Design a protein around this ligand. Structure first.
Ligand SMILES: Nc1ncnc2c1ncn2[C@@H]1O[C@H](COP(=O)(O)OP(=O)(O)OP(=O)(O)O)[C@@H](O)[C@H]1O
Ligand SMILES: Nc1ncnc2c1ncn2[C@@H]1O[C@H](COP(=O)(O)OP(=O)(O)OP(=O)(O)O)[C@@H](O)[C@H]1O
Ligand SMILES: [Ca+2]
Ligand SMILES: [Ca+2]
Lengths: 369, 339, 116, 165, 126, 133
């Protein structure tokens, strides 16, 4: 009846698009515009192709590339549908400029001439799949690890922090770490390779002292891995020390205190009537939330920063503090599914969605927000 | 006495089909394999790569023809056959942290894990989704082995807390009420009906009888302990000179067979008269090993006959060999073995 | 702990079987005091040390399974303090105990949560 | 003092604490490690047992549900034998990458340390492993003695040759 | 400091040894070592360089195969004679810079480090 | 001539050195490709043969100019500079570079100390710093 609704998440590095209602994404392609100079369709050929990213750290840099990216996202490769005869729902990042949000709908009403549009907050959509009103949505993709606090369907822009450490930075940390270990890899040639190795064997440990101990003393953390060239490398403690920059951002020469310290200093910096509520509902969504062992470390450090500062040494008064974080099994793309749910729910619900006629008559900023 | 060399690595879980026509197993991998039997040689037919880690538990609902599986992937998959492809459905376990078995009712499954909470789970047809309520009362450790009783309302499980408790995971929204059992009258979801008295050794094995009168379990203190509610929940233990047992199952109402780190399937009988357990002996008598499997047994299910009169015993171990046993051949071999 | 005189009488009598059988009575395993456990361990060690080599088989065969486990545990506790060449006698005793109770004895010794 | 029954009780204890199994971490999400090494759960750690054949040479076994750590302190007769033992134990420790049943550092208060993991216990025969330990001890003794004799011989030859010129 | 370090590049077909800072190598020898066809100083009877190519009482062996080392002990003896017999410089009183292949393994670099630091006790290694 | 044509004495090899160098420069980072094609250094004894680098640079620049023309014919490009360097000590360059590195003061700062070797372990020699630029 509504001419097929859809949902598209255009992230920094990985774009995930799926039909509304789908429990997963119906197409997941790498976000990179490629050009030739000689006489997942672009990622296959990158050694001899000039690749560019339209969405830099969440924001769009080159509209001439973003337009073609949209034409390739709605093209006969992944979606294969008419933009003028189908509605859509895009995902936006927290702390985004009003100019960006305006230009988005502007280009979605004029360039693509869509008949339907429905934007929503990624921090809100990520919790929407979990079915909650108040919670902490922390997104760590390839651009930046922004920590957003949501409450009653809204996010305090004065409470939304951000750590400049992303999956790309994890890759660079792993590739830098392996070099010291004795091996040798290139900064640009084996980029995706290093990213894969990190995605595979690397992780985040709970007890850094005990993990370092297990690595130095025992030979149980050391695992082997085969490369594309056929040669094999054996990485040990480098597996965990590389992702450990997520907890302490001083290991990569960055300004900040750490994701755990950021979340904790943003938790105690809330209303005292909401402090016991926001500490019991924290949603983990983003590519960097698939690192085996992040949940335990977050819970532990969050426990530390509310027992050294909130309890101030009081051991007995530590148990009373609620501590419950949920690492969902489908947390890898909660932003997408959360949309795929919303777009399925508000498919034909009243008329709370931007129209083309309302975008052609008047108001490119026709946004009830 | 029919051992089949399938792989070189160890085995995780052993499952069978309704008519025992197909067998399913996992080889400590991110995927689970399903093989059938076409003649003397066996050949693989299905492969499921849904889980994202080493598969720990897997059980197949016979009448329902539907196999559920849950392991290190911190998730559960209620796989059902869809045409020529086994489609898996992600049943949320809701656990922040190694066992699974369907009920006799084949309507809800128990998922005992390291979250110190026996996560029972039924299928809500109202929301077209699986829900998992967690029974965590009086539970201090992971659920090694979980086995149902004939009531399909009371579950038994051994823990790393050196005890084998028999609690109730009865969801009153998926079945009718439960009749009065000898193990108690008050049966509520989360209510602890029974427990062990051991303070040593881990309860790696646990299985209830067919009559539902007695519940036995194997502890890792080189000791096996069977309890009978027929004699006011009397507990009868016995220390084996052999190593610890890993899996425990009953062949008859008074005769059980079990193996483990001893790497050799053993038989035992418990006299209701005196009220004590007795050892039958070594049913598996013949690398360098003196037995079929070159490692410890890891699981032991029943092929056909029931827990009152098993005609064939299926044994999976850490040796990578499928040990198919028969009570008839075993009784024809060892003449000094009273079942 | 155990009683010293009951063992001293059988020791004076020459009947080592009675002394060995009495030394393992009421072992301080549930006890929290390390002194009582040290005393019981030292006592059992003293009992086993004076014993002749060829006669050990009978006395070892006279004990029970639970007693074999308690003796194995006490021997493990005594093994942490090797002195006055008691290690050889404790070794022969460990061999006899191993042959008697099998791997189950030591397994029960390692799996034990409360012991001497 | 020294007997074969010592390495028989050692072999038996090694056989008893080779009953390990794979187990996931209960504290960390999707982590898997040796229980005996980190010692994080007191519920999974068994009572460690020590066996001493003498006041100088002994073997300490610390078992777990998912690990078995065996430390071995060999006999020290002379200073040269001690330096050689340290050097050989170190040389073996460096190749801990090859020996997946040994660890890079020796246990405190022991000569050498080998961590037999549950993963290592699942991909190698327990009987063959016990045999490997026993052979490790007897070979340690014999090889140490042979090395001593060879070294002494070399010193004698060099001294004689230098004196003859 | 006051003295000069030694430089040694072991190639497949020819080994180039000398002192750093010099215009040319102080000794450019062949990559082959003489051996017997064992206890005592049996390892001290080892000849390297050109004086091993055509030995008749001994056997001529090649160590560096395709840039990578195949037999470590032989290369060790060769470096020994290169240090004492060909260079004759105090190892404890001098540093050393060794060359690696393009496909040199990390473990191989580790082993080389072990042989150079533990046996020779070099004051510097690179 | 066996280098310029491997097909002469090897049935299991058909690639000429020109093609090998071309693929090596092309299969690497594009941003450093021009630099790799600019500084082509000959090392080892087997490269001391007369007029080797001349023919090498000839074939390389030939294929390069060809591909450039092909790309400029269908273009609805800048001059690719290529240079094969011939060093004076190209016979033993591997040792020469070492002698030139060890002569600098930085080689005393970069070289792993025996102290660090005994204190930390063999891993101290696992990563050698690069200086001199
Ligand atoms: N198993 C894994 N463990 C840890 N990190 C991973 C894993 N898989 C992918 N990643 C990382 O996640 C990043 C991308 O995640 P994701 O697609 O969820 O965010 P994004 O949409 O690309 O970024 P943003 O939302 O900030 O624009 C990659 O850089 C990758 O390194
Ligand atoms: N005057 C010469 N002109 C050209 N080639 C020569 C000359 N003399 C020797 N060669 C060749 O050079 C080869 C040795 O070269 P080089 O010294 O670069 O290799 P290496 O360093 O010994 O071994 P690797 O290259 O594996 O390190 C010999 O095989 C020989 O055939
Ligand atoms: Ca995202
Ligand atoms: Ca060379």
């Amino acid at each position: 009846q509504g001419r097929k609704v859809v949902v598209c998440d255009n992230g920094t590095g990985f774009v995930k698009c799926g039909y509304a209602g789908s429990n997963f994404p119906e197409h997941i392609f790498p976000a990179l515009v490629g050009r030739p100079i000689i006489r997942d369709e672009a990622s296959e050929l990158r050694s001899m192709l000039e690749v560019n990213y339209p969405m830099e750290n969440g924001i769009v840099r080159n509209w001439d590339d973003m337009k073609h990216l949209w034409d390739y996202t709605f093209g006969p490769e992944k979606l294969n549908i008419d933009t003028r005869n189908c509605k859509i729902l895009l995902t936006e990042p927290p702390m985004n400029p009003t100019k960006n949000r305006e230009k988005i709908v502007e280009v979605m009403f004029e360039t693509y001439q869509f008949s339907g549009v429905y934007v929503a907050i990624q921090a809100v959509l990520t919790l929407y799949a979990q079915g909650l009103l108040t919670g902490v949505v922390v997104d760590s993709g390839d651009g930046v690890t922004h920590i957003c606090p949501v409450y009653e369907g809204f996010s305090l822009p004065h409470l939304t922090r951000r750590l400049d450490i992303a999956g790309r930075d994890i890759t660079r940390y792993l590739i830098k770490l392996l070099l010291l270990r004795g091996y040798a890899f290139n900064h640009s040639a084996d980029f995706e390779t290093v990213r894969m190795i990190k995605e595979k064997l690397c992780y985040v440990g709970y007890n850094i002292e005990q993990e370092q101990k297990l690595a130095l003393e025992t030979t149980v953390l050391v695992e082997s891995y085969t490369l594309p060239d056929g040669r094999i490398i054996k990485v040990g403690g480098e597996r965990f020390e590389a992702p450990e920059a997520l907890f302490q951002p001083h290991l990569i020469n960055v300004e900040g205190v750490g994701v755990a310290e950021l979340l904790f200093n943003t938790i105690q910096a809330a209303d005292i009537d909401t402090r016991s509520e926001f500490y019991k509902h924290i949603v983990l969504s983003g590519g960097s939330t698939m690192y085996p062992g992040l949940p335990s470390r977050l819970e532990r450090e969050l426990k530390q920063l509310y027992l050294e500062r909130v309890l101030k040494g009081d051991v007995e008064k530590l148990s009373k503090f609620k501590i419950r974080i949920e690492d969902p099994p489908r947390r890898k793309h909660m932003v997408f599914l959360g949309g795929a749910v919303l777009a399925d729910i508000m498919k034909d619900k009243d008329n709370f969605w931007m129209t083309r006629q309302e975008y052609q008559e008047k108001g490119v900023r026709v946004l009830e927000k | 006495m029919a051992y089949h060399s399938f792989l070189v690595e160890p085995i995780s879980c052993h499952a069978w089909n309704k008519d025992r026509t197909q067998i399913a197993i996992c080889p400590n991998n991110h995927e689970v394999h399903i093989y059938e039997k076409s003649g003397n040689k066996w050949v693989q037919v299905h492969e499921l790569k849904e889980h994202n880690g080493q598969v720990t538990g897997i059980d197949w609902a016979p009448d329902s023809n539907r196999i559920v599986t849950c392991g290190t992937d911190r998730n559960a998959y209620v796989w059902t056959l869809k045409g020529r492809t086994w489609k898996p459905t992600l049943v949320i376990l809701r656990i922040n942290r190694r066992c699974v078995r369907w009920a006799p009712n084949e309507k809800k499954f128990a998922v005992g894990s390291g979250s110190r909470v026996i996560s029972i789970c039924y299928f809500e047809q109202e929301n077209d989704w699986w829900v998992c309520k967690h029974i965590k009362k009086p539970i201090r450790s992971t659920v090694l082995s979980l086995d149902w009783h004939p009531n399909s309302v009371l579950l038994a499980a051994g823990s790393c807390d050196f005890k084998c408790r028999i609690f109730s995971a009865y969801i009153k929204e998926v079945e009718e009420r439960p009749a009065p059992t000898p193990w108690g009258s008050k049966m509520p979801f989360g209510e602890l009906m029974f427990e062990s008295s051991s303070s040593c050794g881990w309860v790696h094995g646990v299985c209830f009888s067919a009559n539902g009168s007695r519940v036995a379990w194997v502890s890792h203190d080189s000791t096996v302990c069977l309890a009978d509610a027929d004699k006011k929940m009397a507990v009868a233990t016995l220390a084996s000179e052999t190593l610890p047992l890993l899996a425990v199952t009953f062949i008859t109402e008074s005769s059980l067979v079990a193996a483990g780190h001893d790497c050799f399937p053993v038989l035992f009988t418990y006299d209701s008269a005196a009220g004590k357990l007795s050892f039958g002996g070594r049913l598996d008598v013949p690398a360098g090993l003196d037995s079929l499997h070159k490692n410890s047994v890891s699981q032991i299910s029943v092929l056909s006959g029931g827990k009152a009169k098993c005609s064939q015993f299926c044994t999976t171990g850490m040796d990578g060999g499928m040990s198919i046993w028969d009570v008839r051949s075993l009784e024809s071999a060892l003449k000094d073995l009273k079942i | 702990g155990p009683d010293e005189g009951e063992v001293d009488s059988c020791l004076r009598q020459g009947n080592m079987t009675a002394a060995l059988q009495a030394a393992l009575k009421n072992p301080p395993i549930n006890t929290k005091s390390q002194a009582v456990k040290d005393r019981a361990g030292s006592i059992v060690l003293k009992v086993l040390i004076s014993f002749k080599a060829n006669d050990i088989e009978k006395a070892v065969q006279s004990l029970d399974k639970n007693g074999v486990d308690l003796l194995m545990k006490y021997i493990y506790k005594g093994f942490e303090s090797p002195s006055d060449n008691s290690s050889a006698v404790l070794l022969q005793w460990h061999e006899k105990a191993l042959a008697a109770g099998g791997v189950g004895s030591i397994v029960r010794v390692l799996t034990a949560r409360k012991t001497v | 003092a020294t007997l074969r029954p010592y390495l028989s009780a050692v072999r038996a204890t090694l056989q008893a604490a080779l009953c390990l199994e794979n187990f996931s971490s209960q504290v960390v999400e999707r982590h898997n490690k040796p229980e005996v090494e980190v010692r994080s759960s007191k519920e999974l750690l068994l009572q460690p047992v020590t066996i001493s054949r003498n006041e100088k040479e002994k073997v300490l076994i610390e078992g777990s549900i998912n690990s078995v750590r065996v430390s071995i302190a060999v006999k020290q007769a002379d200073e040269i034998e001690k330096i050689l033992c340290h050097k050989f134990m170190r040389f073996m420790m460096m190749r801990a990458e090859n020996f997946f049943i040994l660890r890079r550092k020796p246990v405190e208060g022991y000569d050498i340390s080998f961590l037999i993991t549950n993963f290592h216990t699942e991909q190698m025969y327990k009987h063959k492993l016990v045999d490997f330990v026993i052979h490790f001890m007897e070979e340690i003794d014999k090889e140490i003695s042979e090395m001593k004799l060879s070294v002494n011989a070399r010193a004698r030859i060099v001294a004689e040759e230098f004196l003859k010129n | 400091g006051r003295l000069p370090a030694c430089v040694v590049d072991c190639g497949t077909g020819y080994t180039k040894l000398g002192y750093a800072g010099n215009t040319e190598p102080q000794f450019i020898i062949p990559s082959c070592i003489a051996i017997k066809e064992m206890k005592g100083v049996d390892d001290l009877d080892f000849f390297i360089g050109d004086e091993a190519i055509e030995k008749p009482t001994y056997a001529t062996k090649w160590p560096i195969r395709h840039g990578i080392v195949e037999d470590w002990d032989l290369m060790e003896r060769f470096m020994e004679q290169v240090i004492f017999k060909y260079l004759r410089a105090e190892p404890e009183d001098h540093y050393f810079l060794l060359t690696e292949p393009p496909l040199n393994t990390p473990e191989n670099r580790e082993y080389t480090a072990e042989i150079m630091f533990e046996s020779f006790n070099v004051p510097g290694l690179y | 001539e066996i280098f310029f044509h491997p097909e002469f004495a090897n049935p299991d090899f058909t690639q000429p050195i020109s093609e090998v160098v071309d693929e090596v420069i092309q299969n690497c980072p594009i941003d450093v490709r021009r630099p790799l094609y600019k500084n082509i250094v000959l090392s080892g004894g087997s490269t001391m043969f007369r007029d080797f680098g001349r023919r090498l640079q000839r074939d390389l620049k030939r294929t390069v100019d060809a591909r450039l023309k092909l790309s400029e014919e269908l273009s609805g490009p800048k001059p690719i500079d290529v240079q094969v360097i011939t060093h004076h000590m190209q016979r033993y360059a591997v040792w020469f570079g070492g002698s030139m590195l060890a002569s600098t003061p930085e080689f005393y700062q970069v070289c792993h100390t025996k102290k660090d070797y005994e204190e930390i372990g063999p891993s101290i020699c696992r990563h050698n710093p690069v200086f001199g630029v």
